[PDB]
């Protein structure tokens, strides 16, 4: 009986309650100690962890330290108190089923013990939690500390609560459902107290564990890609992997590439220009420079800021090339540059080898040379050796006729610098890629309606995430080997979306190449870190 | 133990009961406060909501406000009391199964909080409800109010009870059964009281939420369509959608079309007449007018009142046309009209283009012209420019030979005005269309027996519903995004039938085009609003 009535209740204490309160008087009187408060007499949600059938008996599923961030109201009280002492009560709620079976171990690890595969939890003083249990199992975490109280920001040695598999999960069916969800509920014990009030301006946890940076509208509203500034309408998985390093920021404060996160401008000053044909009338202007001549870019020397990282396609004559990256721009002379009036055109930029003779596409940035060839006729063609470009940052895709080529780019055309981390499918999970509807040259009126499927362009990660990750350091905010998981809820289903230590995003679709639409998406919700062996759910509307 | 014995029982109070009774004395003494009454010591049915496997953890299933309409006996007591105060007790009964799993959150939201996807119920003071639970979980709703009492008709700020998914519903089988039903039972608490008696003539809720308008006989007895005045014997689904706007009334007090809801008469005064052939003996009289010349119709100018909204079929010679709309009628001259004696015939009416030359069928009403051609020979043919028609409102279907053509109309032949809302299948639900056995011209004795299948004509919605909707305004009686659902019970099964904000009716048959017979239908029952993501049940007799 846990209702909203006057109620008798029973707030269960800890084993060391007489010595916890008495020695916590070094911080003064105990604060927020009152047993009739309704933040102390109820269980509230703390965390959910997935227990799958593919886990060893004794493998650790849920580990957490003694901390006031384990409860939503003691963490709220923690910003106005510079010190805490006392125990905590944990309740475990299993989703389960009648057909499922297997037990779990919940025990309080004393301080000074490593937590891992070698730890044997079944010989600790523990409680046993079935998969098919109705009434949730309650354990109490005593405050076993070498200090008198735990100051917030440096709590010292704290006990640890470890959830391990007592008997492995069995499903007598076979496939389909092969995982379960267990909910941890947390209530303060009798001896829990706060001491030594502080100003709430002081803060300890400033890394959300990459959380508050990805909210819901980011996907059903505002939100742009890393290649074009297009609105995100889809996630599309790729099996096998891909690599992106242009505006892709990892969880530390670093990147491997050029192009600071802003769609402003592409401007380069030194580099050679040419045009074919003996007649200087109605030709295609071709500009080239080598890799490593960008002195003005303070991040990386390999490219000007905003240069597209795609491989040049070899085309000649009056034919419009299939796919690619075109942008509107002009060529300008050096020595206090004023541009030439009679050359402003759409230009396709990219990476080649063997310019200006036999042009071949390139995969690696080392040994490559940046090329810039016009797709439309221009009445003047210059050939001066100091010359540069000025191309807008937002681009469109050049197409021969209408229809729909493919989602652009493909995973093999994307250029990488040396030393880049590659996405790899782990388990049944596979990486995703964020899609956006972009304008094209074969059809300017590419409204998302009739007259063939509209063109989709795919970038790696959302820009809000790039902006909110660039400033902060998250070297300990996510434990390697796991990913941080959000919970998307559609109108007729739900999905789990992960985020690794490398900036990549994962979904458990498996071997499928079908676009997933965020038309009916409503809300997202943080969950926390979860390991890579657990398959993210795919209970979609289909 | 809840029997019909003398009984000790326990009527569980609320947390603010001492201040709820004392401050509700502003309305005088508390009324209907007696703890031995059997309307206060028992749980009674309030609502049922469907919890499906396709719902996100934390998605809201059941929301309800603190109100005396939550109990069947306090709502009965509410018409004779102008004010109430006190709490309420809620009990949740799950159908469930042993093989099902997943939990729910029941919590009382304090006033001043929005209810939606952003609301997190799991951190409220709550109770947990399993899917496989036997004993029903009881929560108490305290009366947390900024006022002293809630006057009926304007209760002010009230607490809200929100049911959210704690762990998502899992079915280890696969398909087939993918939803569950949860029943909410409601009992008044200890401090519930009424104040300030009023005359029962005063009423607050006058919108049943479109409910009492659709009873059972409407389908197994009286009840007619919107096209012919035929008795309803079937519902037939269509996949893909359809549009009807003639006598189709949406949930507001409006329509998009002509034809007030009554099968009286079709009468038009101005329009041209003709007959082919040089001989004025045994010809087919052809009458035409343009769209927009109907001055006499006060609703819409596009047609006379009662004109059938079907596309004219092009036929010539002595052949009887297949399908269509024929009705008995005559042509009358203007200037205090007395009709011509020698022309009374069956006429096929409809919509064409390019009259009287190359006649083509029309889809949109704009740019069309109303046509009226006789199917049988008539000994006189007039050609006077002011002439009109007088055709009875009830019609029959013209057929070349007996047999059975198809159900008429098809979804593509039905004409629409510009600005019409179209039916669309959402989820596994699909729209239905009400069938009726109508007389034909190829076989007058079309009794529902032997000698081929009888002809079926289909209209959009039942007329009782059109009559009972025309007068009242239901702008808030059904929350958009959902539909109001009734529960049909046959002799060997049951079905859920929905009703949206546009007047369309839904059933969860899926991709099937099979007629469903209301021969063994017995009773219907209201349920309430239910969202469009939930699939309506199809446990039929087969």
Q: Nearest-CA neighbor of B537 among B491, B476, B487?
A: B487
Q: Do A42 and B125 touch (CB under 8 A)?
A: yes
Q: Which two tokens stand for residue A299?
A: 């991040």
Closest partner residue to A95 (CB to CB) among B59, B101, B126 is: B101
Per residue, the 3-state secondary structure of A176-233, as one string, reads CCCEEEEEEEEEECCCCEECCCCCCCCCCCCCCCCCCCCCCCCCCCCCCCCCCCCCEE
Report how far residue B279's alpha carbon sits from residue B380's, in angstroms, rounded to the nearest whole number. Answer: 10
Largest Cα separation within chain A, whole Å, is: 98
Q: Nearest-CA neighbor of B483 among B472, B496, B471, B470?
A: B496
Q: Do A93 and B128 touch (CB under 8 A)?
A: yes
Q: Nearest-CA neighbor of B396 among B444, B350, B331?
A: B444
CA distances to A315, A478, B10, B35 from B41, in Å:
85, 54, 8, 7
Report how far residue A211's alpha carbon sits from residue A479's, in angstroms, rounded to the nearest whole number. Answer: 14
Per residue, the 3-state secondary structure of B236-275, as one string, reads EECCCCCCCCCCCCCCCCCCCCCCCCCCCEEEECCEEEEC
Report how far residue A249's alpha carbon sits from residue A245's, in angstroms, rounded to the nearest whole number. Answer: 8
Q: Between A and B, how many CB-CB pairs are < 8 A? A: 127
User: Do the beta carbons of residue A430 and residue A511 sit within 8 Å?
Assistant: yes
Closest partner residue to B54 (CB to CB) among A173, A488, A492 is: A492
Lateral strand order in the sheet of A160-165? A60-65, A160-165, A103-109, A126-130
Q: Which two tokens stand for residue B459?
A: 């209209």
> Which residue's entry shows tokens 């036997």?
B134
Closest partner residue to A487 (CB to CB) among B56, B142, B174 is: B56
User: Do the beta carbons of residue B210 and residue B478 sit within 8 Å?
Assistant: yes
A511 CA: distance to closest CA in chain B (Å): 20
Q: CA gyration radius for chain A?
A: 29
> Which residue's entry shows tokens 């409407």?
B218
Report how far residue A220's alpha carbon sits from residue A210's, in angstroms, rounded to the nearest whole number. Answer: 20
Report how far residue A485's alpha carbon sits from residue A210's, in angstroms, rounded to the nearest whole number. Answer: 10
A253 CA: distance to closest CA in chain B (Å): 31
Report how far residue A44's alpha carbon sits from residue A416's, in angstroms, rounded to the nearest whole number. Answer: 47
Closest partner residue to B125 (CB to CB) among A38, A99, A216 is: A38
> Which residue's entry shows tokens 């030359």?
B357
- A-chain CB neighbours of B117 within 8 Å are 216, 489, 522-523
Report how far residue A542's alpha carbon sits from residue B518's, in angstroms, rounded to the nearest whole number. Answer: 31
Q: Quick one: closest CA in A to B170, which residue? A: A177
Q: Nearest-CA neighbor of A353 among A382, A312, A391, A303?
A: A312
> Which residue's entry shows tokens 């063997």?
A354
Which residues touch A383 (CB under 8 Å, ≥6 apart)? A273, A274, A275
Burial group, residue A205, by CB count within 10 angstroms (0-12, 13-18, 19+): middle
Q: Do A4 and B101 touch (CB under 8 A)?
A: no
Which residues touch A132 (CB under 8 Å, ≥6 apart)? A94, A96, A97, A98, A100, A101
Q: How far apart are the first and last CA of chain A?
A: 39
Report how far residue B310's alpha carbon sits from residue B307's, in angstroms, rounded to the nearest whole number. Answer: 9
Q: Which two tokens stand for residue A120?
A: 């044997």
b/e code B99-134 from CB counts within 10 Å (16+ = b): bbbbbbbbbbbeeeeeeebebebbebbbbbbbbbbe
- This structure's resolution (angstroms)? 3.3
Q: Which two tokens stand for residue A443?
A: 């059809």
Q: Residue A409, preceding bond cis, omega within 30 degrees?
A: yes
Q: Do B132 and A97 touch (CB under 8 A)?
A: yes
Report how far residue A259's alpha carbon sits from residue A158's, in angstroms, rounded to the nearest whole number. Answer: 44
Closest partner residue to B172 (CB to CB) among A44, A97, A537 is: A97
CA distances to A288, A448, B246, B482, B513 from B240, in Å:
55, 20, 20, 20, 11
Q: Do A490 and B56 touch (CB under 8 A)?
A: yes
Which residues touch B112 (CB under 8 Å, ≥6 apart)? B157
Q: In the Cβ-directed half-sphere of B113, how many Cα atoms lie within 13 Å?
A: 20
Report how far residue B102's alpha carbon sits from residue A93's, in angstroms, rounded to the nearest whole number. Answer: 10
Q: Do B133 and A134 touch (CB under 8 A)?
A: yes
User: Do the beta carbons of residue A109 and residue A44 sit within 8 Å?
Assistant: no
Report how far residue B133's alpha carbon sits from residue B103's, in angstroms, rounded to the nearest whole number. Answer: 10
User: Do the beta carbons of residue B42 and residue B2 sit within 8 Å?
Assistant: yes
Which of B172, B511, B533 would you mutate first to test chain A, the one with the most A CBs within 10 A?
B172
Partners of residue B137 on adjacent β-strands: B92
Report how far residue A52's alpha carbon sits from residue B86's, in angstroms, rounded to the nearest whole number. Answer: 46
A405 CA: distance to closest CA in chain B (Å): 29
- B-chain CB neighbours of A518 within 8 Å are none
How many CB atoms lie under 10 A from the CB of residue B241?
A: 13
Q: Which two tokens stand for residue A436?
A: 């956006």
3-state secondary structure of A334: coil
CA distances to A53, A62, A67, A88, A482 from A529, in Å:
19, 10, 17, 22, 6
User: Do the beta carbons of residue B486 and residue B208 sit within 8 Å?
Assistant: no
Report how far residue A386's alpha carbon sits from residue A416's, in angstroms, rounded to the nearest whole number. Answer: 28
User: Do the beta carbons of residue B324 and residue B313 sit within 8 Å?
Assistant: yes
Report how far residue B101's alpha carbon sits from residue A94's, in angstroms, rounded to the nearest whole number. Answer: 9
- A-chain CB neighbours of B533 within 8 Å are 491-492, 541
Report how far residue A121's alpha carbon sits from residue B141's, in angstroms, rounded to the nearest whole number. Answer: 42
User: Do the beta carbons of residue A348 and residue A325 sit within 8 Å?
Assistant: yes
3-state secondary structure of B47: strand
Angle (CA) B242 B243 B245, round 5°? 155
User: Do the beta carbons of residue A78 and residue A139 sit within 8 Å?
Assistant: no
In DSSP notation, B449-493 reads SSSSPPPEEEESS-HHHHHHHHSS--SSSS-TTEEEEEEEE-SS-
Technique behind the model = cryo-EM
């Amino acid at each position: 009986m846990d209702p909203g009535v006057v109620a008798t209740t029973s707030v269960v204490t800890a084993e060391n309650s007489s010595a916890s309160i008495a020695t916590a008087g070094i911080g003064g009187p105990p604060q927020q100690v009152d047993q009739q408060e309704t933040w102390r007499t109820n269980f509230y949600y703390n965390d959910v962890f997935t227990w799958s059938v593919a886990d060893a008996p004794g493998s650790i599923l849920y580990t957490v330290q003694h901390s006031p961030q384990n409860n939503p109201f003691t963490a709220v009280l923690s910003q106005m108190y510079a010190g805490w002492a006392g125990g905590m009560q944990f309740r475990f709620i299993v989703a389960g089923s009648g057909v499922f079976g297997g037990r779990l171990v919940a025990a309080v690890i004393p301080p000074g013990i490593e937590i891992g595969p070698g730890l044997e939890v079944r010989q600790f003083p523990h409680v046993v939690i079935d998969a098919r249990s109705l009434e949730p199992v309650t354990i109490t975490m005593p405050d076993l500390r070498p200090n008198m109280y735990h100051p917030t920001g440096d709590p010292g040695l704290v006990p640890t609560l470890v959830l391990s598999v007592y008997n492995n999960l069995i499903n007598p069916f076979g496939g389909s459902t092969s995982a379960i969800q267990v909910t941890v509920e947390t209530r303060p014990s009798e001896d829990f107290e706060f001491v030594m009030i502080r100003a709430p301006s002081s803060k300890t946890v400033d890394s959300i564990s990459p959380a508050g940076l990805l909210t819901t509208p980011v996907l059903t509203g505002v939100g742009n890609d890393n290649r074009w500034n297009g609105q995100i309408v889809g996630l599309q998985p790729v099996p096998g992997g891909f690599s992106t390093c242009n505006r892709h920021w990892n969880l530390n404060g670093s990147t491997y590439g050029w192009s600071s996160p802003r769609f402003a401008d592409i401007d380069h000053r030194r580099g050679s220009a040419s045009y074919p044909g003996n007649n200087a009338t109605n030709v295609l202007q071709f500009w080239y420079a080598n890799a490593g001549s960008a002195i003005d870019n303070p991040i990386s020397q390999v490219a000007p800021d905003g240069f597209p990282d795609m491989s040049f396609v070899p085309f000649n004559g009056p034919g419009i090339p299939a796919a690619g990256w075109v942008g509107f721009g002009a060529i300008w002379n050096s020595n206090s540059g004023a541009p030439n009036v009679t050359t402003v055109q759409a230009y396709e930029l990219g990476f080649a080898t063997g310019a200006p003779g036999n042009l071949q596409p390139t995969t690696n940035t080392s040994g490559s040379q940046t090329v810039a060839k016009s797709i439309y006729a221009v009445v003047t063609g210059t050939a001066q050796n100091p010359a540069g470009l000025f191309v807008m940052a937002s681009g469109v895709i050049s197409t021969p006729s209408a229809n729909a080529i493919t989602y652009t780019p493909q995973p093999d055309r994307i250029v990488t610098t040396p030393g880049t981390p590659a996405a790899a499918p782990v388990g049944k999970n596979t990486p995703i890629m964020f899609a956006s509807v972009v304008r094209r040259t074969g059809d300017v009126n590419a409204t998302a309606g009739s007259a063939n499927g509209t063109q989709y362009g795919t970038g790696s990660q959302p820009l809000p995430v790039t902006i909110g990750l660039s400033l902060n350091n998250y070297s300990s905010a996510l434990m390697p080997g796991q990913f941080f998981v959000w919970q998307l809820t559609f109108a007729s289903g739900f999905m789990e979306i992960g985020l690794s230590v490398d900036g990549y995003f994962y979904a458990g679709t498996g071997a499928s190449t079908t676009l997933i639409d965020l038309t009916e998406l409503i809300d997202v919700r943080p969950v926390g870190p979860r390991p890579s062996k657990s398959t993210l759910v795919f209970n979609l509307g289909g």
